[PDB]
Amino acid sequence: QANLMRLKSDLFNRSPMYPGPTKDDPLTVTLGFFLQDIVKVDSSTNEVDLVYYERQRWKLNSLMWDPNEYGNITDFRTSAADIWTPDITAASSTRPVQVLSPQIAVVTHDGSVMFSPAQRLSFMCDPTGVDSEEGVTCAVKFESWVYSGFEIDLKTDTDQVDLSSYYASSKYEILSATQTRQVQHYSCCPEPYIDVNLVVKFRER
Amino acid sequence: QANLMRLKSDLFNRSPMYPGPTKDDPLTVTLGFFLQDIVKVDSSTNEVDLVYYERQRWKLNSLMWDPNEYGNITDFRTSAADIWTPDITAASSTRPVQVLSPQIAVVTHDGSVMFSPAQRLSFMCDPTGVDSEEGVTCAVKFESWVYSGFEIDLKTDTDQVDLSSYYASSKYEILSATQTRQVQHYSCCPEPYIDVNLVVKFRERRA
Amino acid sequence: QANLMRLKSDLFNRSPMYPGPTKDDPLTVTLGFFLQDIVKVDSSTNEVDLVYYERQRWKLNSLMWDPNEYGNITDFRTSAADIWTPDITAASSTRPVQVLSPQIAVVTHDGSVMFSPAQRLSFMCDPTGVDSEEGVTCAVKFESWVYSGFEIDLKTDTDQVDLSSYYASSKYEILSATQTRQVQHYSCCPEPYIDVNLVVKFRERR
Amino acid sequence: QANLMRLKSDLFNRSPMYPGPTKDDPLTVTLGFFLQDIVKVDSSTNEVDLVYYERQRWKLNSLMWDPNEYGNITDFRTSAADIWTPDITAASSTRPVQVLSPQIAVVTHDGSVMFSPAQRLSFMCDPTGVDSEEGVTCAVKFESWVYSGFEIDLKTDTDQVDLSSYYASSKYEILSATQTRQVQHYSCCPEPYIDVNLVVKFRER
Amino acid sequence: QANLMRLKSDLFNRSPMYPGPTKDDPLTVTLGFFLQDIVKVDSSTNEVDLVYYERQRWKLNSLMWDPNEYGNITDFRTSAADIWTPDITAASSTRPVQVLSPQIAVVTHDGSVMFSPAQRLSFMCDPTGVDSEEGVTCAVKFESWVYSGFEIDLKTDTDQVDLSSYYASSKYEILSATQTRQVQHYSCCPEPYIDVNLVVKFRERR
Ligand SMILES: *[C@@H]1O[C@H](CO)[C@@H](O)[C@H](O)[C@H]1NC(C)=O
Ligand SMILES: *[C@@H]1O[C@H](CO)[C@@H](O)[C@H](O)[C@H]1NC(C)=O
Ligand SMILES: *[C@@H]1O[C@H](CO)[C@@H](O)[C@H](O)[C@H]1NC(C)=O
Ligand SMILES: *[C@@H]1O[C@H](CO)[C@@H](O)[C@H](O)[C@H]1NC(C)=O
């Protein structure tokens, strides 16, 4: 405990918080989605509600340490308020995101940070054809609200959405679920626009 | 990072927050609306729900810096809790406005601030005629709740509401959407208020 | 800005907040209601929902200043958390009051404070007869939860509720809306309370 | 106001907050209920919703003063955040208690504190027979969540629930309403566990 | 009171909060469930709502004291904000867990902490067959969100789900209720991931 207290003090009390990336010092953030349940579908309003968690990872040199100097501690957990976190947002949400997990992150000795908030999300989606055999396809884009592709680069570690925690007796069954980095370039402008597109194909079970 | 950390420390940790405008030192705020979706319409209660984001811009001398003194940094991002933001409110909302985006602002070296919160709003609107070809018109005023036109002047950069992010498979299609500066006098108060009136003409999509 | 920063520092950082009125130093608070919309009516539960804002005004000597000493500043805006505010409550609400406006007050150099929160309120009311020509009457009392009439006196400046912000195409139309100072007696206590009774007569816009 | 400011400063700024009762220094808390309205009854979920206010009184030597030393002030009002308050809870609530009044208490010079929060409560109750002439009886227990009867003794000042503020045009009428202290002793342990049982008999009007 | 005030000051004001367990200094946390009511069932969305309380126990050397030095105080109560608490979460909730009790823990002189929050939970469960004699079976997993089995070793304090506080006139009756630790190992990683699985068999009471 003494070792961890000394480590947290050295990281958080001495130096200030990471102020965020700039064009000179950009930051890669990796996203992965873990789908738990398609809870409901509203054809009256074209809204769908998803429960999932979202693994976010980035790496900062200011959060590095030598385990030997701190009783061989290789990682620790801390409140997400104690560190900078990225502003990743669902671009087409229709209600505030409801947080289902504690807001706590894992920091490892190489300066890697992992933050995995569980969420209930309502987003825009026309569910006509969900009651058929072919099903329906909906998509939602995740992006940094205020950082361009020159400051925050988004990527995924895999293209497959993890369905290992997907509830077997959900009202809706998953035909397909992918997560894909998309880069948009406009003729006008030099900076790319980056998003991660979550595409889910599903139908009534 | 060192340069940005020093800059944020100089701006936020040394000086206090901007205390808001006065009659001697008024402030112009520019508003632009970006409509995403008319989510629902309730004829039983005459309430309509809109999803949109709202670009707010203002300029403060207290947030200025010289890029040369901070490694040529021309701008940065910060939590909206770190700065004063204006008290712009929908005057006819029926439920508290729900925030859909992170509360983060962009500050540039000339002291300009840009803050663009995404929002879900329920407001008063009679939707009779939405199922027709002519559609229905609703209006909602946005204004400072407590600053008169002598302290906060509102403007728009354009009169056309941006529909580029509008959801193609919405139940409702937009016939027209304008944003217009107005001057209001209220029974409460002798000082006039400035509002931006968002007027949207829409109907059920025949799809 | 320098002048306003110095003023706010002199008022809020040096002295403590006003601790509230006592029997020796009572306080008058003026209330006006501005009705916006009767949003819904629930006959299954006898609940009605109102959207309105409530203008509250009082005066404190501890919030006075000389404009000459502060660049001719005659007033300013500040978070309602920075000042004492009165504990005015709807006595017959059935749900917590939902706040629709920022919690910000106007303070003027004579020590006058104006605080005007916009609110959605659910309160107890039997709406039988709302679909008729005569309509229905509902009433809700606003009062200090813990200060008697010897500490907080409530008044209104007018007996007519302001309907200038009332939504023209509301499902419900207003036949009458008054705001009236009363004295309220509780079994518990010998001291009377002052309330403002908001009485609204309305019907379906047929 | 100078006298009241000095008094509040002497009580709250100098000493810390009362840390709660112990077995050596127990505390009596008195509870009284004032019923305003039975708002709804849900037979689909066996939930009933009540609006009421709850008078809580206790007495602390740490909140005593001599009126002569403070301009003859015999009492004052203060935010409930400035003082310790008891952890009285409805044991059979089905939703978080919703607070309908400002969180403010009255403190008197003998160290008595009165705190009377207005509340909307959903609690477990089977309302079968509410539409009959006999009506239906429901009960809800109030207790300290973490203090045993050796630390907090609960009592009522009367056994009759005050119905003087009960809404005349409620959908439901009250046939009877009592509030009664109950003590439970367990084989395991020496300490008694105390609750106040609020029993309400009612029917459709 | 003086003794308890001095104790709380020595524990909380001098030292910082316990920063959480590590691989070098792991922590055992016990969970036990006390089921109060199955409030509702939604077959349209396959959601069920449960009211229960959850007894959590762990032990820390940083919260130890000698009763002789503090007027023979063997235990006290404190706000859960004053201490580290474990990050136990329902992994299959569909809405944020609603807290029904005050957030207060019991700390004893050997450094044992007991924290028992009451909660309303909506979780994923297909209730087809709840209206039958056989009933329906649902499960909900509880786990530390961010601590592996190398940091928090999570277990049950008892083998029985306590049904003694279960409401007799609930719409639903409990046929069976178990609580069980489960361990998962992944190809990626050496550390085990632990959950406690609450399995409840129930049906409509008629
Ligand atoms: C430090 O921990 C690592 C991780 O398991 C292990 O390989 C090593 O044996 C430990 N070293 C010491 C000095 O304890
Ligand atoms: C800032 O810009 C000037 C001119 O382009 C350049 O010489 C200088 O190296 C820059 N300063 C830093 C610290 O990068
Ligand atoms: C503004 O300040 C100057 C300071 O000398 C004073 O002469 C003047 O009277 C003030 N304005 C008003 C309207 O009082
Ligand atoms: C602690 O216990 C001793 C007996 O061993 C007793 O005499 C003493 O009074 C106790 N202390 C307090 C403060 O009660």
Half-sphere exposure at residue D47, Cβ-oriented, CA atoms within 13 angstroms = 19
CB atoms within 10 A of CB A82: 14
Q: What is the DSSP letter of D190?
A: S
CA pair distance C19, D6, nearest whole angstrom? 10
Tell if the CB–CB gap between D47 and E39 is shorter than 8 Å: yes
Could you tell which of E1, E72, E73 is best to mutate to test the pocket of ligand 4, judged by most ligand atoms within 8 Å of the CB?
E72
Asked if the Cβ–Cβ distance from C146 to D77 is below 8 Å, we say yes
Resolution of this entry in Å? Answer: 2.1
Placement of tokens 């980095």 in the chain? A181
- Decide: E84 and E147 in contact? Cβ < 8 Å: no
Q: Torsion angle of alpha carbons A96, A97, A102, A103, nearest 10°? A: -80
Domains of chain D, start order = 1-205 (2.70.170.10)
CB spacing of A95 vs B98 below 8 angstroms? yes
Query: Would you say C121 and C48 are in contact if contact means Cβ atoms under 8 Å apart?
Result: no
Of the candidates B5, B104, B120, the beta carbon closest to that of A87 is on B104
DSSP symbol at B13: I
d(CA B203, CA B176): 10
Tokens in use for D40?
A: 């709804």
Structure tokens at A37: 């349940």
Going from the Cα of E149 to the center of ligand 1, the distance in angstroms, rounded, reads: 17
Cα C21 to Cα C7: distance, rounded to the nearest angstrom: 24
Q: Which residues of A fall in the annotated binding site for Ca(2+)?
A: 164
Q: Is B72 in the pocket of ligand 2 (CB under 6 A)?
A: yes
Our mutation pick for probing the ligand 2 site, out of B65, B70, B72, counting the most ligand atoms within 8 A of Cβ, is B72
In chain B, residues with a C-beta closer than 8 Å to the C-beta of C40 are 44-45
Question: b/e string for D12-40 if b means 16 or more Cβ within 10 A?
Answer: eeeeeebbbbbeeeebebbbbbbbbbbbb
Environment class of D146 (CB within 10 Å of its CB; exposed 0-12, middle 13-18, buried 19+): buried
Considering only CA atoms, which of E160, E153, E137, E136 is closest in space to residue E193? E153
Contacts of D105 in chain C (CB under 8 A): 146
- d(CA B136, CA B172) in angstroms, rounded, equals 11
For residue E3, the ligand closest to its alpha carbon is 4
Asked if residue B71 has its Cβ within 6 Å of ligand 2, the reply is yes
Residues of chain C with Cβ-Cβ distance to D101 below 8 Å are 89, 145
Q: How far apart are CA C186 and CA C190, in angstroms?
A: 8
Ligand nearest the Cα of residue D23 is 4
Mutating to test ligand 3, I would choose from C3, C65, C66, C68 the residue with most ligand atoms within 8 A of its C-beta, which is C68
Distance CA D41, CA D165 (A): 20
Q: Kindly tell me the burial class for residue B169, based on how many C-beta atoms sit within 10 Å of its own C-beta (0-12, 13-18, 19 or more).
A: middle
Instruction: Give all strands (DSSP E) within chain C, no chain letters.
Output: 27-42, 47-64, 75-79, 88-90, 98-99, 104-108, 110-115, 118-124, 136-144, 152-155, 172-184, 193-204
Nearest CA to ligand 3 atom 5: C68
Say whether the E–A interface has 3 or more Cβ pairs within 8 Å.
yes
B137's CB contacts (< 8 A; 6+ apart) are B199, B200, B201
Q: Which atom of ligand 4 is nearest to the CA of E71?
A: 13
Experimental technique, in short, is: X-ray
B201 close to B137: Cβ distance less than 8 angstroms? yes
The pair of three-digit structure tokens given for residue A187, joined into one six-digit string: 């003729």
Alpha-carbon distance A140 to A91, whole Å? Answer: 7
Alpha carbon of E110 to those of C35, C68, C112, E63, E151: distances in Å?
60, 64, 57, 8, 21
Question: Chain E residue closest to D98 (CA)?
Answer: E100
Minimal CA–CA distance to B50: which of B122, B133, B150, B126?
A: B122
Three-state DSSP string of chain A = CHHHHHHHHHHHHHCCCCCCCCCCCCEEEEEEEEEEEEEEEECCCCEEEEEEEEEEEEEEEEEECCHHHHCCCCEEEEEHHHCCCCCEEECCECCCCEECCCCEEEEECEEEEEECCEEEEEEECCCCCCCCCCCEEEEEEEEECCCCCCCEEEEECCCECECCCCCCCCCEEEEEEEEEEEEECCCCCCCCEEEEEEEEEEEEC
Query: Both tokens of residue D95?
Result: 């939703």
Q: What is the DSSP letter of D96?
A: P
Per-residue b/e over C138-148, b at no fewer than 16 CB within 10 Å?
A: bebbbbbbbbb
Q: Tokens standing for E193?
A: 């991931």
Q: Do chains B and C touch (3 or more CB pairs under 8 A)?
A: yes
Q: How far is CA B111 from the centre of its chain?
A: 19
What gap in Å lies between CA B28 and CA B111, rounded to an integer?
A: 13
Beta bridge partners, A121, equal A50
Q: What is the spatial distance between Cα D200 and Cα D183, in angstroms, rounded to a whole number?
A: 20
d(Cα D198, Cα D178) in Å, to the nearest integer?
6
Alpha carbon distance D4, B6 (integer Å)? 45
For the purposes of burial, counting CB atoms within 10 Å of the CB of C167, is it exposed (0-12), middle (13-18) or buried (19 or more)? buried
Instruction: Please list, in sequence order, all residues whose beta carbon lies within 8 angstroms of the beta carbon of residue D140, skipping any fewer than 6 positions away.
Output: D90, D91, D92, D93, D121, D123, D124, D125, D197, D198
Amino acid at E114: M
| Token pair of D163 as six digits | 């119905």
Ligand 3, closest atom to CA C72? 1
Residue nearest to atom 1 of ligand 3 (CA): C72
Annotate C172-189 with b (16+ C-beta within 10 A) or e (fewer).
bebeebbbeeeeeeeeee
Q: Which residues are registered as beta bridge partners of A88?
A: A144
H-helix or E-strand spanning residue D8: helix D2-8
Instruction: Return the residue matching tokens 């909140």.
Output: D63
What pairs with residue E162 in β-bridges? E34
CB count in 10 Å sphere of residue A63: 20
Cα separation, B89 vs C99, whole angstroms: 12
Beta-strand relationship, D88-90 and D75-79: unpaired
For ligand 4, is residue E72 a contact (CB within 6 Å)?
yes
Across-strand partners of E202?
Answer: E136, E174
Q: Which residues contact D68 (CB under 8 A, 6 or more apart)?
A: none
Q: Which residue has the tokens 């649902």?
A: E138
Residues 6+ apart with CB under 8 A from D26: D150, D151, D152, D153
- Strand, coil or helix: what is D148? coil
> Rounded CA gap, B62 and B76, in Å?
15
